[model samples]
Target: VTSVPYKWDNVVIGGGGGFMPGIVFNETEKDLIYARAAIGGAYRWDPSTETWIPLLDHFQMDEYSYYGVESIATDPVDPNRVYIVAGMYTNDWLPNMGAILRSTDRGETWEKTILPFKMGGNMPGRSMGERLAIDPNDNRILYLGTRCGNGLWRSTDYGVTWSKVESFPNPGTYIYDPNFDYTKDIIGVVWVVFDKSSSTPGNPTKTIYVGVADKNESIYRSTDGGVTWKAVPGQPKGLLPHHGVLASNGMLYITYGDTCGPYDGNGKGQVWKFNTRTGEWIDITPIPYSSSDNRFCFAGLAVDRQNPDIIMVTSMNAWWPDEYIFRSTDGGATWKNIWEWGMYPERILHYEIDISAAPWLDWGTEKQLPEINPKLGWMIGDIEIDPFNSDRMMYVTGATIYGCDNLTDWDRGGKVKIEVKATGIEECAVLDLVSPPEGAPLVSAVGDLVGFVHDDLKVGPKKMHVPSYSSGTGIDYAELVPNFMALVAKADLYDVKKISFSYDGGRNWFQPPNEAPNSVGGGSVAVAADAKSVIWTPENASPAVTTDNGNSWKVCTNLGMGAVVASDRVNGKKFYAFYNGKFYISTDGGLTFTDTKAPQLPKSVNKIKAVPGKEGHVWLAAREGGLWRSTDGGYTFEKLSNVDTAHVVGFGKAAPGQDYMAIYITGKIDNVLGFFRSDDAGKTWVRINDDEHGYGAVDTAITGDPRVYGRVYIATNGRGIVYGEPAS
Candidate 1:
C-alpha cells in the first residue's frame, strides 16, 4: 500500500460541462429531474442543493461502457424509479452493444438488460428523443425505441423482462452524415409517448404514439394495445420529428428538422401540433426569417403544463452568435425570438449571459472563442419546464446544463435568466494539465469545453480566455516565470489563431501575435522559461518556433508531429523533443535542436515530463513501452523494469526526507492497469486508484503537483479531471 488514508476520488475540478441530449421530469414527483449525457453517464438534479449529483461513479471499467446514456425516463408514479438507455455510438467506433439500465431507487441501484441492438448517445441530432417512457396509470409497463434495424421493445414487469413489438411498421429512418461510416446508420424511433386517457389496469395505456425519423409517415399510433400500428395521416413530408410532448389539453407538440443538424443540411425546420382528441395534425410553425434563419433546426421542445398554452422550442444549431429559443404563449399561434433577427448573422442579441459559477467565460481580453464576439454554444438544446413548478426550468447547451428557478418570468418579462447550473457534474476530457510551483494548484487544457485554471479543487474552475473558439490541445507553463503560461487549441472555423497566453496565472489570456504555423488548430505549445519565445507542433505539421513572443513562426526543419516535446522547467534556455525514436536537445533558448547521444527509443512514445527544480532531468512514457528516464540533458536513457505499459508520467514530492523525487504514472503493473506512485523513484509503486474508481478512459493526460507530496492528477476522455492524494 501507499501507506496513506486517502486513495483517489473526484477533486471537484469542473471543466466545461458536457452535452445532455435529453432531460426527463417526474410527472408525479417534486424536484425530481434527470439528464442523460452522450458520453459522461447520467445525473440527477438535487433541488435542495440547487446542483446536480452524478449517478454512475461506481460503475467499474467493465460497466464503464454504459456511460453514454441514450435516453432517460423518470417514472410518473414512483419518484425513486428511473430508466436510462445506455450505449455510445452505432458505428465501429465502439465495439459493444447498449443496455437498458433500470434504477428502482432513483439511480441508487441499477439492473441492466443488455440490448441486442446498438445505441447512439452522441450521434447527430442526438437530442432527438426521450425514446423511453413508462405507462402512466400502470408503473409496470414500459417501452423503449431503439436505433438501427432494432424496432420497438416493451417491458411488462417494470423493466424486468422485455419483448419486441413485432407488428409496428417503419422502424425509423434517420441516418447521420452520409459521408462517414461512423454515422451512416438508421436512427430508428425518435420518441415513445403514452396517452393515459386511453388506459386501464389490465392494459394501462391502449393508445400510444411513436415519432420516427422518416419525415413521411413519422407519427404512428397503436390503439389496440400495441398489437397493430398505423401511420397518422398528413404528417410533414421532408422534416424529421425530433421530439414530441403532450400537454394536459390532449394537444401533442412536436419539433422537426431536415437532418441530424447542429452542423448539417440547410436551415429547414417546423413545429406542429396534433390533437389526440381529434386525430388531426396542425402545422402551427411560426414564420421564419428564411429556410436558413442562421441555418437552424429545432431540437428541444417543452410545454409548461402549469400554464398549458405556454410552450418553448430551441434550434439544434444556430452556428453564429446564439441559437434561436422561441417561446409561444398561445400554443404555437404566435412567438417571440430570443432577440430580433439582425442583418449580421453572428450579432443576434442574447438574454442575460450569466456564467457566474464559472467566470472564466469573461477571462479573455476579447473572449478566446470567436474573433469579434463570443457567445454561448447551444447545441443539443434539451429544454424542459417543471411539471409541478412552471417557474423552474432546465435546458442544455453545447457546454453545460443551464437552469433557472424563475423561468415563468419569461412569460411576464420576455426573458428567463439562466445560470451554469452544472454543479457536481464534472465531465472534462482533459487534454493537458500543468502544475507549476507558483500560482493556482493546476492549469488544464481540455476538449469539447475549453480548459480552465483551477484555484480551488472543490468547486468548478473558470473557463479560459474569451473567444475560446476550440477544444484545447495542450497547455504549458514557464517554470522560471510561473506567471507566464501558454495553451493551444484546434479550431473548426479555420480563421482564428490556435495559441493564447496568460500572464497573470491564467486570470486572463492574450492571443498570440501571429497566426499558428499550421492550418490545423490543435497541438502542443510551450513558452520559454523567460517567457520570451514559444515552440509548437501542430498535430499535422512540423515543429515551429516563435522568437518574438509569437510575432512570427518558422519551422524547425528537424522535428515533426507525434514527437514528444517538453520545455526544460528549471533551465530557461533549454528544451527537449524526440524524433524517429531519438531524443533531440535545444540549448539556444528553444531556437534550434539537434539529435542527442541517447539510445533510440521505442515505436509508440506518448508523454514526456521534465523535473521542475532538477535541471536536465526528464521522463518519457510510451504505449506498451516501459518508462524511461534521463538526468544528463538527454544524453542517454534508462528504462524502468518494474512497469509493463506506460502512457503518462510526472514527478512530485517524496515521503518526508527521502531524496529521489516521487514519480507517478497512469500505466500497467503486474499485468493489471492502474495509477501508481513511487516514493523511491521507480523502485516500489503503490496503486492509487482502486478497481471501483477507474474514472473512465484515463491515460489521456496526467500530472502530479510538485509542491504537495503524494498529490497526483489524471484526466479522462469523458469523466473529467480528478486528483488523488495519500494520507499521512
Candidate 2:
C-alpha cells in the first residue's frame, strides 16, 4: 500500500502585520525563520531544518473574509505588535474582499480590525500589497498601498478607523512598492512605485518609473505628503523594478530586473544605490545576481539600524538541484550563499530526485478499470472508462495508478495503493486517459499501472522524456515531455498546447500530433476511441478538432464552446461540447457539432460525463447550482437535489450495471467539504465524505471494479493524491 503523511508546526509568532508590514523577526537563535504571504497564504522557511511549513491552511471558507493576507508589518513602538491586512477573498479571482487584522500576542490569536467593503470591480495582480508604512511618532497613523480600488489607504487610531484618501495622485496604480521616512512626519518624503504606469491627471509624468509590463513609467517623488509630486531626475533604465530601501546615511538602494522581453545586455537584474543628495544612481552588480528558473528575482532589503554601511538583503536563488538562500552585506557590494545556515542537504536531494522522476512514472494510463472504490483517491484533470470491460479501469491525476480489486476495503482510511516512482520531472498530472480491456500487458506502460486481485504489487521501470508544453483538449492525449501524457487545452503558460501523454506507460513519450493550433489557450481535451481524432475548447478562439492523431488540426467555428468533454462509451467519434451554459453534440468524430437542446444548465458548466451502461444518460456539474442530469441525450435537463455547498468539478458513474450510481468532488468554493455521491441519476444526493485533508478537488474518477460499486477517487490541488469510499 502507498501512503503519504501530513504534519503541521508553529514556527514563529508576531503581532498584527499584513503581507509587507506586520512584524518580521529572524529568530536565528532558535532557527532562522523567513516568512512571506503571496497568492493569499503565509509560508515560513525554517533555516535550521530547511523546510517550509504552512503558517495557516491554504484555503479558507467564504464567510471568513480573512483570506488573501496581503501584507504584514511590525509595530515601530513595540516589536511584539504585528498587523495583517488583506484584500478580497472570494471564489472568483477579481474584486476581492479587503480587510485588516491585528495580532497583539504574537501570531497566536487574531482579531479583525477592518472588514472588506465592495469596492469597484477592479482586482490587483497577485503581488498587490508590496508596501506598508506606520508613523514612528504615532503608531495610530498608518499608510497602505494596494493594486486596485483605492490605491492608497490610511488608518488612524492604530487601524481602528479606515478611510480611502482620494487626494492621492494615482488611484488606478498598482502600488507594488511604498516606503516612508521614519524621521519625518506622517507624510514627509514618501516614495512609491507603480507596477508599470501611473496616471494622475494630464499627460504621463516623467516622475513615474515605467516597468516592463507597463509603459509610460518613471520614478516619482512627493514633497507634500503625496498631495502633489514631481518626477525624480537622472533615473536608471530598468524593467520590473521592485524593493526600494532608504538607508540611514540618506542613500536609496533599489532592486530592478527584466522579468519579460529580451534580457538586457548584462542579464536582467541589478541592484543600484542612489545618492539622494548628489542625485546620482550607481549600478552595483558585485552583489550576486540570482539565476532561478524563469528569471523571477528575489526581494527584501533591510539596512542595519545601528550602522548604515552594514546592510542586509534577503533573497532566494536556485542552488542547481535545489533552492537556497543568499545574503548580502556592505550595501550591495558583496554577497554570500547562506543555504547551509537553514537547509537540509539530504532532504533537498530527495526533493530534487522526486521532482526529476515525476515525468517518467506512469500516471493515468489504464485501458480497463475495475469497479474498485476510488474514495479519497486523486484523479487527473479528466477520466475515462474501459469500453471492453466495464470492470476494467484506467485513471490519472498527479500520477497514474490502476486498481483491479474492490477498492472499498482499500478506502477504509489506510493506504491501499503504491505510488509509481521515476525521475526528471517537476510536476506530473494526468489530465485524461484511455484503456482497452483487450489490450496486452502493454496496457501497463511506464505511464500505466496494473494490479491483480490477490498478487503482490508491481511498479514499472522509469521512462525517459521531455516535459509537455501543454495538456491537450477533448479526448486527445499529447506528450508534454518525453514520457508524460496529458490532455491538451488552452493554458496560460503556452498557447496551442497539449496536456501530455506517455506511451511507455510514463517512461517515455512523444507528442501524438507534433503540431497544434497557434492560438489555443486551455479548457478541456477529448480523444476518440480509435485515438485518431481529438476535440477541445480554445480560450478565446473557436472550438478545434484534430484528425490523424494530432498531426494536423482544424477549428470548429460552428460551436462557441469554452469547456468541453467527450464520451468514452461512444469513443472519440461521438462527443459533447459545453460552452456558454449549453451542450453541443458531434457524432461524426468532431468534424462538426450541433447544439443539443437541453434544459439550460447553470452558468459555469465545469464538467460533463456519460453514465456507464446508460448510453443516453449524461450528467453535468455546475459551479453555483448542484449537479444536473439529462436522460434524453442532452435534449433537456432537470435540477438534481440542490446542494448549496456543491462546488462540483468532475463526476463519473460506477461500472456498467449501475445506472444510478455516480461520484464527484466539491470544487474551490469551500475546502472543508470534499466529495459527494448520488444515486438514481441525481434524483437524490448524499455527502459521502468531506476530507479537509487537501486544498480542493480539481478532478475525480471511479475505479472499474464491479465488486466495489460505490468506491470513488479524487485529485486535489495541494494535498497530492488521496482515495476514499462511501462512509456507512
Candidate 3:
C-alpha cells in the first residue's frame, strides 16, 4: 500500500469461506467468544448486536500480517484481557517474525511484543490450539508453543514479555505434508491447557498439560506447577492431537488424527478420554476405524461445561456422501449421529439450516454430484459450546459457520435444526464482479460460497435467492439490456455443468431449456444483446454457443479457449473477447467469432471489460502487458500511457466536468505498485491505498461501482472481498 492524500479504509463485503483457524471462549464469561481466520484475523462475539466484530480491520500493512492469528486466548478471571499469537505464514509469505498482541480491553487495542520464531497461522493444524494460554488462577502466567523448534514459552507480568521454557521437553517436530509449502515448517507444540481443577491452595496453577505434534508421546504433564514435566502415561501415540480439553469432573478429552485437518486426513482418528485421578485412558472414538477402515480424522471436540458429562465432536471432514457429527450426554459412551437411515426424500439427520439471510449459500442438490449432499457440512473440527449455556453451540464447516441454538434437543430425542449464523462475516474468494446501471447494483462471482446479486450494498443480510451453484466463476451484464445478466460456474455444485441467466436484473435465474450441452463446467459466458443466445467457454473444452435456451449447442471454432468475454452494453448482438492479445468479434448474435489483425498488443490478457452504458468502450488488461482501451468496439485499440502493469481494471461514476468516467486499477504506475483511481479516465491517477492497505497480491478481480463516484471493489486469493468508499 502506498500512502495517498485522502483517507480511506477497506471494509469487508459479505461473503464467507469455511476458514476459521481458531476458536476461543472466556472461561468466566459467556458473552465473550472469538473466532479467527487463517487470513482474516480475529473476530469478537458482540452479544448485544449478535454479530462478530472484526478486531483487525484497522491494522496498517505493517500490522496487517497479524490477521492470520495462530491462536487466541482470553484470561479466565479477567474477561477484558485477550492475547493473540499473530502471524500469517513463516516461509516468506509473511516477513515479520511472530508476535504476541495483548489487549487489556478484550481486543479493542493491542500491545505488540515481537517473538524470535515465526508463526504459521495459515498452516496445517491451524485450528488446533490455545497454543497461547492464560493461567486461570493467575492471569499473569501465560504459555505459548513456538514452531521452528523454538520450544515452549512462559509469559509473566500479564504478557508484557516472554521467556523460553527450556525445561519443557521435545521442541516438537511434526509435518503432515513435506511436499506442501504451507505446512512444511509447522512443527511445534499443539496446545497448552491448564488443569485448574487439580490445582491446590498452595499453587493454584499447579497442574498443567502440554500437547505436542510428536507421535512417541503426544502429551506431557506437570503435577507440581512449573517444577517439572513428564509424559502422561498411557496416552495415545502415532497420531497428532488436535485439541486437549479438561472437564470439571477430572476428565480430559483429546481428539487425534493421522493428519492435520481440514486438508490432511489419513482416514483414521481417535477421541480419547483421560482420567486425571485414575491415570486411565478410555478409547472413546465416535466412529470405529481400524487400519483397513480408516477414514475421517476427528478435529472439533467440545464438552458442556454446565453439564460435565455431556460431550460433542465432529469429524475433520465427512469426505464421503454425508458429514457426521456426534453428541453424547454420558461422556462418549453412546453417541447419536446427525443423520441415518430414512426414505429417499427424508433422512434421519435432524438439521435444517436457515440461510434466508444469505441465500447464496442455499446450494441445492444435484443428483449427478451425489457425493455432495449440500447439507453435510465438512471441514468442521472447531466445535464449541457456550460456556454458561449448555443448549447453545457452534461449529465451523468449510462453507459457513453453523450454530445449534437448540443443542439440548439432542439429549431429548428430536430433530435439531442447525442454522447458518454467518451474518456480517464474508470470507468468500471473489473472482469477478459486475455492476449495472439498471436493476441490481452489483452481481458477483466468487469461490466456495458462490456469488450474489447485491440489491443494496449497505444492507447485505439477504443474498442472491435462486439458481444456486457452489462456485460462481464469472458474471456479465448486457449493455443494451442492462437487466439481462449471465453467470457461469464450475462443476463443484450439484455437479451439473452450470450456466444461468437472469431476465429482470438478476432477480431470477433460468438454465437453457434444451439448446446448450449440459457441461461439466461453464467457466466464462457472454450474452447477446437480446439475451436469447449464450456464448460459453469451459475449463477443459472449446468455446461454444447456445441459441435454443441450452437445448442445443454449436462449437465456435474461430475463438480459442480461456479468453475473457464481454458483451456490447448498447448493442445486443455485438460481443468482444481477447485471447493471448488476439482480439475476436461476434456480431451475429455471438454465433460465430472472427479474429482481428488489430495490431499486436501485450502478451497475457487475463481481464477485459466493456464499460457500462458506454458503447464501444472496452478495455483489455494484463498484470505485465499494460492496459489497452478500444473506443470503437473491437475495431481498434490504444494503451493507457500511465499504466505500467495492469492486473485488473474497472470504471466508476464520472466526474462532473469530464466526458470520461472515473477509472480505477490495481496496478503499477511509474513502476510504483498500488491501487489507483483516475477521475479523468486514466489520464491522471491518484493512489487510493496507502502503505497500510497494501492488500496483498491483489491480482484477482476489481470493479468500480457505476452509480457512485470514487467507490471501488477488489478481490484477493484468500483474504475475501474488500471495498473502499471515499472518506465521508
Candidate 4:
C-alpha cells in the first residue's frame, strides 16, 4: 500500500458533541495542554491557533479500539514529552490489547508499547483520574494503574517497555453491577500520583500514591519507590476514590463517591483532605448530604498550583435545573455555588453563558424543559487550573469544554463569563450522510445530536433542525426535488412524532398531525423524487408510507420489518427494499411490493442505493457477497467480480467528459479493504486513502459530493465525519 495523493479534513462542526473524559496540563511549561476523549483519542493544544490538534488520527482499521484514551500524562521535567494509555473496551468485543503510546515531540508523533491485557476508556469509571503518571525526578520511570484487575504496572525506560508491579497489594474489587454486561466488570486500579517533593534531584521518586476503585482500602502508599506497598491506615471506607490530587505542601485531597460513574450516582459523596506527613483525615465536604433529594456525587476536582487553598469541584449527577460547580478560597472550608436559590421557584446565577463559538448548542431554552435547558455541562469528567496563569482553567464535559478566562473575578464579587473552550475537536459519531445536487451540499444523521444540514462546510452551524430527537437513524432527500427531505430518529420521550419532513432543504422541520404506529420506532426512511411518496422501514415493525407529505400513513404490503429500503433517484413511482437475501420492489409509489425473483444474496446486507439521472438503476452493498449492480431496478443483478466485500456505495459527478457517474465504495478491492473510486463503471479501481488513515470500520456511512468532481465524505463510528479531495 502506498500513500494516496489526497488531503483530508474534518467537517468543521466545531466541538462535535461527545464525552471528553479528562484534560491534563504540563505544569513545567506555559500554555501546554492535552485532553483525552473517551472514544476519540487525544488532542494536544496549540497555543498559537488556540485550537486542539488531534494526535491519533493515523490509527488503522484493526487499531480502532486504540482511539479510546484511558489516561494521559505529561513529563514535569520535559515539557515536550507525553504519554497516553489507549484502548476502547476490555470486553470480549475487542480482541486487541491496549498499549502505552509515548511521544517526545508533544504528541506530534507516537511510539506504542503493547500491554498484555486490555484497557477500557469508554467503559464505566473512565473519567476518574490520571491513571498514567510520570515521575518528575526521573523522566525514564513511569507508573500506570489498570482496570479489570490487571493490577499496577511500571516502565523503566521512558515507556518503551513495561512490567507488572507484583508487590502492590489490592486489585480493585468494585463493580457497579453483577448482571449487566457493561457495568459488571471490575473497576480495578484508577489513579497514580507521584510525591515529587520527596525525591532528590537526580534520583527516582521515593514516595508515590495510588488510588483504586474499591469500597474498602482504596488508597495505598509506597515509600521506597514502589518496592513496598501498604493501605493507608485510618482512611475512609465504603466509597470509591474518583480523584486524588497532591498539593506541593504534602497535602493530599480525594473525592469519594458510592459508585464508579459516568452515570447513576444516586448515592452520597464526600470530599476529604489527607496530610501525607501526619496521616490525618479531615472532612472538608462543602455540602452535607442531609436529604435524599441531594444525591449528586462529586467528580471533577482541581486545586490551584500557586495557591493550594483555592480549589474547585463539580457535582457528577446533579441532573436538575443545572449541574453545580463549587469554588473554595480557603481549602474547602467554605464554598460558593455557581447558582443559588433566589426565592421560591427562582434561581440566581453568578456567571453568564457565552456560546458565541458554537451557537447550535440549544439547551431547550425556548421550551423551558429542565432536563434539557440551562445546563452548565453534565457528566463532569476532569478539571484543571493553569499553574502558570491562575486566571486560565478548563474542564471536560459530556458535550463540550466550558471555562472562564476571568476566573479570578469570581473571588472579587464580579460575575464570571463562561464560553466554549473546545475548538478543532470534532468527535461526533456520524451515522449517515447524504449529498444532493441542489440545496445543501451535505446532510448528516448523527448520534446524540440528531443531525445537521451543512450549507457551508467552513462555518459552524448556528442551530440544529427544530423538534429534534435523540439521534437521527436515517435520512434522505428527493433527488429530483432537492427541497424535499425526510428523516427518522430515536426519540427519548414517548411521542408519536418520530418522523419529520423538511420542505425548504432542511431549513425548517415539522411533524405531521397524524400519528405513526407506536411500534414504528426509528430505522430507515426514503423519499420519492417528485415528493409524492415517503416510505419508512422501522425496526421490528411493518413498512409504512405517507403520500400527503406525512399528513397520513398506511402500511406497505409483502415486505416485513427489518428490511433495507431506497427510492429510485429518477423515477417517482419506484422504491426498492431487500430483506434476508430476498428482493422486493414497489412500482406504485411504495403502496405495495412484489418479488423481483432475483438470485438469493448474502444475508449481511448494508445498504441500497439508486443512481441519479437514470431510472431503474440500482446498487446493493453486501458485506459478505461483494457489490451487486442492477440496471433493471432489482429485477436482476451482477456482482462486481474484482471486489470481495463492500460496506457502502455512492455516486458523484462523472470525470471530465465521461457520460457515466463516478462510483465510490468503501470495501475490499484486490483483497485490501480501503476507500476506492471507479471512474470506468466498476471495471477498475484507484485507492483514495493512504495507509495512515484506515479510520476503523467504514460501515457506518459514505457519500460523494455531487457538485465536486473528486470530493467524497465518509462518516466514522466514533471519529466524526471527514471529507477528502484531490491534493493537486
Candidate 5:
C-alpha cells in the first residue's frame, strides 16, 4: 500500500438545508460574522464573496458529534478570536463530551477545551440563545450557558480553561418533555449577554445578563461582576424569553415565546421592553397573544446598535400564512410587518425573496397560493443587524440563511431584497450516493432537502425532486439502463409520497400507484439491471418486490427485518440481501429469496455492493469482520487478508490500464484508518485521503465515477458529500 497525492472538495448543493440556530457578529470589526447550525458545523461569513466559509470541517471520527454547535461567540474586542460550544446531543448515544473550540486566527485553526458535561446543539431548544459570550471590555473573560443542568461557566483566559459560576441564582428549570431523550434533558442557561456600558477596559464586565428557559424567572443579572446574581426585577412572566438584546440606549428588548422551539410550539408570547435605568417593564407586543389563540409567539429578535429604536422580531409559528418579521422604528412603540393581508388571495409584501442560488428552496410551490407556500423561511430563531452596517442584516432559518444588504430600505417603506447567502457552507447529512456508468455524474440521498441529481458539481440544482420529502434514505440506479432510478425517502407530512421512480436519470420523477410496506418513512432500495424489477427494504418491515412499476408488491419470503439489499449490476434476474450475517439471494428478479448460510461474516454489516459488469460477484463491508468478496453469489465469501475493519465499499472506473474495477472504501488497512483505493482487486491499497481530509463519520455511503479514473465520492454523516481526485 502506498500514499497518494489527492485533493478533496465538497459537492456543492448550497446551504446544507438544515437548521442554523444562530448568527454572531464582532462589534469591533466590520463584516465579521459567524453562524452556527444544529447538525452541520459552524461557518464564518466571507464578505468578499458574499458567502460563508465553514470552520469546523476538521473534526474527525471520534469528534463527529462536535458538528452540532450549541452556541457561537465572537470576541467584540478582538475580531480575530472566535469560539463555539460544540456537541450534538446530551443522550448516552453521543460518545464524547462537548468542547469549546477557540480559534485565534479567525477560524482558520482551532484549540479545543473539553467540557465536563454535554451540550445539545441539535436538541429541541437549540435556537433559544447564543449560549457562548465573550466580555467586550476584557477579551479574555468569557461566559457560557450550559444545558442538562450543568449551570453557568466562565473562562478567564481566552477560553483556555473554564469553571462553574456557582453564585448564579438560576441554572434553568425548564424541560419540554421529561420522558423523551431529545427533550427530557434540562434546557439550562440558554444565553449569556455582557453589558459593555457598565464595565471598563482591562477589567471584567460588571453587569451581565443570563436568559434561562424557565417561564417565571427567566432573566438574571450580575451587577457585582460574577460575585453574586439575581433575577431582573419587574420582568414579564408566564412565557420563555427566547431572545434578549440590550440596546445602546440603556433599554433591554426581549421576545418571548411559549415554548423553546424549532420543534414543539403551542403557547403564547409577548414583546417586552425593559428600561435598564428605570427598572420599568412595558408590553409593546405588535401582535399580543389572546387567550383563544396560541400562535402569537416570537422567537428571533434583533436591535440596531447605532439606532437603538430600530428592532426586528420574527413570528415563532405563523406556519399558515408564512412567518412574519416585524420591524419597529420607535422602540416597539410602532411596528410593521414584512407582509400584510391585501385582498382575498393577495398580500402586500415589503420584501422580495430570491433563491436562485438554491432554487430547491421553492420546495414544489411554484404555483401554490402564497399562504400555502411561504418562501421567507420557517423556524426562524436568530436574527442580526450588523453593528458596523445597519443596512446589512441576516437571519437564520430551518432551511437556509437569508439576508439583505438593504434592510434599512424596509424602514422607509420600500421593498428589501433578500436572497440565500449560504455558499461554502454545505451542512447536509449525506445518506447515500450513486454514480452509474452513464447519465448524470452523481445522484444523492441526503438527510434534508431530500435528494438531488448533480450534473455540475459546482452549481446548485435549479430544483429538487418534486413532491419533496424531508429526507431521502436510499437511492439506486440500473447500471445497464442508467436512465431508470429509484429512491426511498422519509416524509414529515402524510400527503408527501415516500417512494419515487425516475425513467430518465432524474430529470423528472413519478410516484407509483402503491408503495411498499412501511415505506412512508426511510429504507433501502434497488433497481434491477434491466429496469424491470424494484426491491424495497423498508426500515420497519420485510423486503418487498415490485414488477409492474409498483402497481403491486409481494413480500419476499425467508427475509427478516433490517435487511440490506442490492441488485446485481450485470444480471437483471439476480438480487441479494443480508440480515445479521445471514445472506439471502433471489434468482427470479427479487420475487423470492433463499438463505446462503455464508461463513465468517460479521453480524453487523454496513453495506453490500454487487460488482458491476459481473454476474455472481459481490462485496460486503463489515463493522468488525473487515471486507469480504464472493464469486459464487452469496453462498461463499473470502475475507480480504489486508483489511482489518470496513465501513463502506464501492467500485469506480478501473485505474489507468487496469481491467478490474477500482474499489474504494473507508476502512483500516495496515493499522491505518482512512479512505483507501485498490486497483488490483483488493490485493494492495493506497491511502487516498490524508489526515486533514477526514470527513467526520464517512460511513454513510460512497461511490466512484465510472467515467473518470481516480475520482471518488464520499458521503459523510454531517460534513456533506465530498469528492476526491488524484492531485497531479
Candidate 6:
C-alpha cells in the first residue's frame, strides 16, 4: 500500500455581508478539504493553532474562469459582508460568462448578482475587473470599472440594480489613475494626461490620466463628483505624471516619469512636488544615477502622514539592474537609500524596477506614524495600510499577493502545493489452478494434467482444446465447464476442418463427429441443458439442432437466426438468436422463431449471453454500443450505466446466487489509455489500471471464491493478467 499527499491554499478577506471576519489557513498540521460549491467554501485561519477550520460551504456558482476572480471587496460598515466578481477570462484567456457574486457571512456563502446585460460572451482576448469603489455613506451605491465593453458601471441598490454611467467616452481609462477624496466630496476625477503627440501614431497611445489628463500638465479637479471639472494650474511641465498623493501638510506631491516619447529622449527622469496653496511646482531632483545612460525613472511616490516633509519614491534604471527605494526626510530635498531595510538587496543594484506604493491618504497622522518604513516603502503595485491595523499592509507584484511585517520581513511567498493518490491492484500475469472432487489445490502449466480431473481449472498438454479451422466461421455461442471448452477459428480458404473440445482442462483435446448438421458458411455454437444436445448457426447454414451432442442434427431454415443459444437452466427448449440488430426467441427449441423487442443498440452485435441461474435476465455486449442488459428475457433492454466508453470484450457470472459479473474495455482520453470495472451490475465503476501498467487491457474474467465476495482476474493484450479483490 502506497499513499501520497495533496495540498491547496485559500485566503478569505471580510466584507460582502455579515460580521466575524473569516480567515482560512491550511498549515502543515491540517489540510483543506474539497467542496461541491465554492461559496461559503472559505475557512478562517486560526493563527494560534496554525490550522484552518471550515466555517461553511454554501456558495452556489460554477467554477469561475481562469482569470475567474477579478476583484474582492468588503462592506465597511459590515466587515463580514464581501463580494467577488468572476468570468473575466477562461483558463486560456478566452472571454466567458461574466457574473458578480456577493457573500453575506464573510465569504462563508454567496449569492450571485445577475448583470442587466450580457458582459463577457466571446468578446475576444481577455477582460478583467479593473476596479471597485463604494460610497461610504451608502454602501448600497457602488462603482465597477472594466477594461472591455462600455467601461464603468454603477450599482445603486447594493449590486441588485446596475446602470451604465455614460458620462465619459472611455471610463476605463480612469481606472488606472483615479482620485476619491471623501473629505472634499469628490467621488472621483477622470482626466486625460497624454495624447497623440506623446505617443507613436497607429498605436493606442496609452496616453491618458485622471484628475490631470492633458499635455499641459494642469491638474483637472472635479468638484461635483466627476460631473463637472476645472483645471488646477501650475502643474509640472515637460514630464508625464502617473500618480499623485494629497499629503497631510496640504501639499500635493506628484510622481512622473519620462520612459516614453520625446520626454525620454535622454532617458533621465525627475520627481516633482506641488504646493496646493502656493500653486507652485518644485523639482525634488532625481536620486544619484547608478546607470551610465541616465536611464533611471521614479515609478511611484508616497508621503508620510506623521512627518509632513517625509516622502518615499521607487526608482528603476534600465531593465537588467535592480529597483531602488529612496526616502527623503526633508520633503524630497535630500534622498537616502532604504532598499536594504525592505529586504531588497538585488533591487539596490538598479537593474529593472517596478514599484507599487500608494501613500497613506485615509488615516490620521498619529495612526500612520508606526508605518513610516513598512507602509511607505515600495514593494509592488499600490500598497495600502490594513484598515484595522496600520502596521499591516497589502501589496501586489505581478499577480502574486504578498504581506510584510515591520517593512522588512515577508512571511508567505509563491503558490500553494497539492498531493495525489492511486488505488487498485498492481502487476498481473497468467497462471493455471485446479482441484479434484475431494483433493487439495493443484497448480501447473497447460502441458501438465491429463486424465486425473477434467475440471476447467485442471491443466495439461492433451487437456488443451484446439479452435476449429473454418473460414468466415463465427462462434454464435460457447461456454467452458469443468472439462470442456470450444471455439470456432476460421481458416484462410473458408473451410470448416473440425469441431474440437477439451475434456482435461485444455491439456488434451478431441474432435466430435461432423454429423451435427454442419453448414457451408461460418456458424455459431451453443450447448443444451442436458449436455447431450448441440445447436449451431452457420453463415449459410440454417439453424441446426442436435439431441445427441454432435451425433445427428436437424436444420430449421425457417428459424432465420444468425447466432443461436440454448439456455441450460431454462431447459433445452428455450433458445435465442441474434439477427439484424434484434433477437429472435424460440420457446419450443429451434423449430420456429418470433421477433422480440430488444434495446435499440448500435451496429455490429457480436456476443449475447443469457445469465446463468437468473431467470429472464440476459447480458449483451456489442461492438460499438458497449454493454446492455435485459430483465424480461430479451423482450426489452437498457444500457448499463458507467460502461458507455469501454468496449466490452468478455463477461460472465461468478456464482449462482450472488450478482457478480466482469467485463473488459479500453479507450484513450487526454493522452492516457486505461480500463474500468463495476461489480454491482455496472451501477458505478472504478479504474483498474491503464497502459501505464504496460500493455493496454484487452480482456477480463472473474473467478468466484467461496470465501470471498468479489474476487476477479483481468487479462490484457500484452500486459498479461491481473486480479482484483474487495478494497480493504
Best by lDDT: 5
Over the stretch 35-72, how does candidate 2's per-residue lDDT look in tens digits?
33322234333444433444334333342234344556
CA RMSD (A), model 2: 15.7
Between candidates 2 and 6, name the one with more favorable TM-score: 2
User: Least lDDT summed over 10 consecutive residues: which range in candidate 2?
Assistant: 9-18
- Model 4: CA > 4 A from native: 1-4, 291-293, 367-374, 493-496, 514-520
lDDT tens per residue, model 3, 1-728: 23445454333344355478666779888678888877777788888877776676545444556777898988888898998898878788768889998898878877889988788887777877768998888788899987767878998788888899878987777876778776677567879889886664334598999989887777999888766889998988898888989998989999988777776544678899999989999998877757454477888889988887788888876566566788888898888887765655446666666665444454543444334344657788688988888878888877677886888887777777777665556555677777777776677777766677666665552454244566777777766677877787764536444877777887778876532443567577777766767777776566678777677789765776666677776677777888756888887767777877787566768778777667778888777788888888777889887788788888888878998778888877776667888887777888887654554556667877788887887776545667787775
Quote the positional error of residue 399 for candidate 3 in Å.
2.3
Residue 461's lDDT in candidate 6: 15
What TM-score number comes out for model 5? 0.97
The sequence of per-residue lDDT tens digits that candidate 6 reaches over residues 194-230 is: 2222234333323222332223433554334435434
RMSD of each: 3.6, 15.7, 4.9, 2.0, 1.6, 23.3
The per-residue C-alpha lDDT of model 6 at residue 102 equals 68
Cα TM-score of candidate 3: 0.81
Encode model 1's per-residue lDDT on 1-728: one tens digit a residue. 34234566565655236677777888888878887787788888898997777787656444556788888889887778899888888877777788888887889778888877778887766788888888887888888888886888899898878888899898877677668887788888879988888876556788899988886668899997788999887677777888898888999898888776545534777888998888788877765535345356777888998876889888767665556778888988898776665654334443666776765544343633222223444675578888888887678866677777777676676466767777777766788888877998988888765677778878766555434466888888888888888888877754667888788877787887585568676888777777767788877877788887678888775787666788887777888997777888899867788998576466667887778778888888985888988888889878888888778888777678788778888778886667888888788887877755666667667778878988998887677887888755
Give the Å error, residue 250, model 1: 2.1
lDDT of 5 at 44: 90
- TM-score, cand. 4: 0.96
Ranking by TM-score: 5, 4, 1, 3, 2, 6
Candidate 6 lDDT for residue 245: 57
Give the per-residue lDDT digits (tens) of candidate 5, residues 603-637.
Answer: 76889999898888989999568899998888998
Over 4 Å off in model 6, which ranges?
1-62, 90-97, 116-130, 172-221, 229-321, 326-335, 340-379, 387-394, 398-402, 408-682, 685-728
Which of the numbered candidates is closest to the native, going by highest TM-score? Answer: 5
By lDDT, the better pick of 3 and 6 is 3
Give the TM-score of each candidate.
0.89, 0.56, 0.81, 0.96, 0.97, 0.38
